[PDB]
Each structure stands twice: as C-alpha cells, then as structure tokens.
C-alpha cells in the first residue's frame, strides 16, 4: 500500500520528462522525422501517464470506495501506452541505423525550416568530401537522435516495470 | 510531514534526469563545449540531488530523530548545488547566442571525434554558401543545444523551489 503514493509521484515525474524529450526531438532536422513523432506518441503517452497518477488521490474508503472503480479502467488504459511506446522507440532506433523500414513526411511547419536536409542517409556522392566538415555535422546529428531515442526508450520501459496491479 | 516522502521521490527522479541530459549533452559536437560540461556539473549535481534524498529515511523519532543531524548539513550542501547549477546553465545559454563570455577546451577524447567543428560561430566566409545544406546543419545543431540547456535550466530550477523544504 504505502508505496502507492510514492509510485504515483514517480509516475508523474516520468510523465513530464516525456513531454520534455518529445518536444526537443521535434526541432527541425530534415524532411524525415522519427515515427514516434509523426505518431505524436510523446504527447499522448505523457498525458496518459499523468492521469494514471490517480493513485495520488489515496484510498478514500469513505462509503463504497472513492477510488472509483472506473479508475481501474483508467489505470488500465495507461498500460497500453507503455508497451506501444517502447515498441515505437525500438523501431525508430532501427530506422536510423540499418535502413528505412518506414518513411514519414514530418509536418509542414517543421519542413519550412529544414527543407533540403535528411539524416537517414548521410554519405556524400563526391569522395573528395569524405573529410569535409559538412559531413561531420551530419554524423553528429545522427548521434544526437540516437541518444534522445535511447533515453526515451529506457524511461518508457521504466513505466512497464511498475504501471501494473 | 507526509508530503516529505513524496518530495524525496520527486527529488530522486529529478536527479536521474540530470544524469541523462548531462550524458546526452557531452556527445561530440566541436572543439568548444558548454561551460557546465567542462565544469562537469551534470554529474555532481545529480549525485548530490540523490544523496539529498536522505529524507527518504522514515522519520524515526527514537528519543532523538534518526535523521542524524549531519543530514541537515547534507541537505544544505545540496541546496548549494542547486543554485550553482542554475546559474551555470543560464550563463551557458548566453554564450551560445551573443558571444563567448568564456571559452573552454572540452576534453581530449571528445575532440577525437569532432576536431574541425565549432557550434559557437556558424556563418560562412563565402557568401555563395549561405544556402548550402552545411549551414542548415550547423543551425540545427545550435537549436538542439539551446533546447537541451533550456530543459536543464527549468528542471534544475525545480529543485530550488523545493529543496529548501
């Protein structure tokens, strides 16, 4: 029992950090964006993770219990976000590093800032360029995207370990 | 009182997020690195934030409280870490956007991967290049660094609001 208030607190913090990383990942970076962003996963995931903080309401055993049983359904929906989010992140991390299993068109107001760029292929057509600074930028950006996605993966996984009765 | 167990839980989550963003920010990205990374702040801050979770101990009032009084010093030093961490981030965010108030040499094994890059000046000497993709690459990297630092700023600030408790 008394762990439950603490667990709720942890769940809420874990929900805010998804909003943070999801926003940061959406900064313009080419015509193609990671699947999870085109799915808008970080926003719904975070929102559901917070609502599932309902156990912060504590055990109001007044009358028939005021943690209303519909809340168990409420708890139950949030588990659906943890699995699907983990699978999405582990899919995107593959699209960056072997080949496009999928491609997604980003969003139009994002494209307005990086229309001539991709990050999923990164090697120049002209071999004279293989040491040009222009190429070192592209590998650095790939490494940042792999980083952000791997941190999302681990903190998302940290829900599934606990968001269950 | 009964807020305190919760506050401790929140403090621990907030501590792990600093380890995460600190590692991500240290990915090779040029000869100059943000002051906070060269100060090595993201590690010590997070560590002291977790240690200051010592209020995670139950309030054992056994004749005199088992929260040994030295822990109050522990809590206080962690508040010093919170203030200093905030100031460092709001300094770094200025060095990106007007000019170098300071420059710091990064670390040698970082430079081994981005020896010909700087993110602090980003404009081509050759005006024919002002629409070359290489410039859009550089501005995108600046925007990612501003993002990471601003998220660090706001989550660090979220200690000082409460670690005084």
């Amino acid at each position, epitope marked *: 029992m008394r762990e439950s208030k603490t667990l709720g607190a942890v769940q809420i913090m874990n929900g805010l950090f998804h909003i943070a990383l999801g926003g940061l990942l959406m900064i313009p970076a080419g015509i193609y964006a990671p699947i999870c962003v085109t799915v808008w996963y970080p926003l719904w995931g975070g929102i559901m993770y917070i609502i599932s903080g309902s156990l912060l309401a504590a055990t109001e055993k007044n009358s028939r219990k005021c943690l209303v049983k519909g809340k168990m359904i409420m708890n139950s929906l949030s588990l659906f976000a943890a699995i699907s989010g983990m699978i999405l992140s582990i899919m995107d991390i593959l699209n960056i590093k072997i080949s496009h299993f999928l491609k997604m068109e980003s969003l139009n107001f994002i494209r307005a800032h990086t229309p001539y760029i991709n990050i999923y292929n990164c090697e120049p057509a002209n071999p*004279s360029e293989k040491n040009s600074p222009s190429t070192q930028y592209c590998y650095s950006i790939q490494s940042l995207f792999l980083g952000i996605l791997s941190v999302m993966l681990i903190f998302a996984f940290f829900q599934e370990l606990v968001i269950a009765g | 009182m009964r807020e305190s167990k919760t506050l401790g839980a929140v403090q621990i989550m907030n501590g792990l997020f600093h380890i995460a963003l600190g590692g991500l920010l240290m990915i090779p990205a040029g000869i100059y690195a943000p002051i906070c990374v060269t100060v090595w702040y993201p590690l010590w801050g997070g560590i002291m934030y977790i240690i200051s979770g010592s209020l995670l101990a139950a309030t054992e009032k056994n004749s005199r409280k088992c929260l040994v009084k030295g822990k109050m010093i522990m809590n206080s030093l962690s508040l010093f870490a919170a203030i200093s961490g905030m100031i460092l981030s709001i300094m770094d965010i200025l060095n990106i956007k007007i000019s170098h108030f300071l420059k710091m040499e990064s670390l040698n094994f970082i430079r081994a991967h981005t020896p010909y890059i700087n993110i602090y000046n980003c404009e081509p000497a050759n005006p024919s290049e002002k629409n070359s993709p290489s410039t859009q690459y550089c501005y995108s990297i600046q925007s990612l660094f501003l993002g990471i630092l601003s998220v660090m700023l706001i989550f660090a600030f979220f200690q000082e609001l409460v670690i005084a408790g």
Partner: antibody, heavy 121, light 107 residues
C-alpha cells in the same frame, strides 16, 4: 580543350567480365572526381558511382554495389571500371564524366564520348 | 532517393511559338540542372544552377523556378531546337535524372 576519351564498343560473352577505360587529357587529373553514368532506352540515365583519384576513395550506388569496381592509375591518367557476371540486362551505353564545383553547386561540365556494351552469345 | 517527374512527354510547337516545359520534384531541391541530348551523342550541359546559361547556349533559352517547381522556357523555337531535355538534381544520394521530354516540330 579538356577531353575524355573512350573506346567505341565491346563484345562480351554472357557471364564473362569486361573492363573499359576513360582517359583524361588537358587538366590536372588528380584534382577532380570522376563519375560513371549508365543509359538504356528503358530506364533513362542512372548513376553508378565515382572515384577520387587523388587518394582512391570511392562511392557506390547500392543498386550497383555488387556489380562494379572502380580504380585509377594515379600516374598514367587513366580510370578503369570493371563489371562482373554480365547478363542481358547490362547492354547499355556507359559514360565517364568530370564534375566541378561551380556557381554554388556541383555540375557535370565535361562528358566522354560513350562506350556501347552488347551482351550476346 | 527522390524522383523527378517531367511533363509533357512529347511537346509540340511551330517556329516562333513560345513553349514551356516543367519538372516537379517529389521534394524541394536547391537547384535544377538541364541537359540536352540528340541521337548519337553524349548529353550536353545546357543550364546550370536553375538559371545560368552554359557557354554558347543561344539567348532564346531561359530557366526559372524555386522549391519543388521549376520550368525551362524557349522564346522562339527554331528547327535546330529539336532534342530531348533531361533535368537533374544533386541535393541527395544518389543524384537522379528525370524521364526526359522530347521536342517535335509541328506541320
């Protein structure tokens, strides 16, 4: 003045291999990238790959990465392409081309006369 | 890899007409380059960087466009203008050529 020279045609037995050459003249050979292009009446123009004779770095289109192999003689000013395991699909015209950075973008400013390959038993 | 679509497939005009032909890319590109080929020769470079005429190209030609949409235009076609025109891009790997446009003479 600048020119690229190629032999006119090749006859090859099926399944054998063929090697064909593009020779440069009139410029500093080691200072520019050399590019290869394939034309057919059914699929237009396709780009095979390139070599930088200044050091031997190469790049390939994945669709051809198993077929071709590019090499250069830094002394004799001659580029070679080798094709292996030829089939009826390969009968096409092959060009070398020189590319230069000009006016803010690359462009193919000089082209060879082209070589015709026929695959037939 | 991005694909360039050209239209029309066959373009038809009388001497002294104005004519235009268009290339549309599936994604926005920095520049389009245009080439001319006739049967039995290598392609020739014709327009580079969207709007700069190559050496010796007659002033009848001009080029224009931006973003995803580009055009090439001929002010007064002449009997020597009969050829096939390919558009080309270098914005991404690999560089790609369009499907070509063939120019006829009306009679």
């Amino acid at each position: 003045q600048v020119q690229l020279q190629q032999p006119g045609a090749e006859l090859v037995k099926p399944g054998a291999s063929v090697k064909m050459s593009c020779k440069a003249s009139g410029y500093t050979f080691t200072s520019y990238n050399m590019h290869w292009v394939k034309q057919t009446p059914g699929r237009g123009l396709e780009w095979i790959g390139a070599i930088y004779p200044g050091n031997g770095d190469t790049s390939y289109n994945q669709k051809f990465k198993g077929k071709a192999t590019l090499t250069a003689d830094k002394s004799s000013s001659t580029a070679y392409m080798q094709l292996s395991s030829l089939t009826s699909e390969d009968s096409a015209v092959y060009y070398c081309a020189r590319s230069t950075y000009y006016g803010g973008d690359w462009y193919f400013n000089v082209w060879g006369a082209g070589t015709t390959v026929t695959v037939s038993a | 890899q991005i694909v360039l679509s050209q239209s029309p497939a066959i373009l038809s005009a009388s001497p002294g007409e104005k004519v235009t032909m268009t290339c549309r890319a599936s994604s926005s590109v920095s520049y389009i380059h245009w080439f001319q080929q006739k049967p039995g020769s290598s392609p020739k470079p014709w327009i580079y960087a969207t709007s700069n005429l190559a050496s010796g190209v007659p002033v009848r030609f001009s080029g224009s466009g931006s973003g995803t949409s580009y055009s090439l235009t001929i002010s007064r076609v002449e009997a020597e203008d009969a050829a096939t025109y390919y558009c080309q891009q270098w914005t991404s790997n690999p560089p790609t050529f369009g499907g070509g446009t063939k120019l006829e003479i009306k009679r």
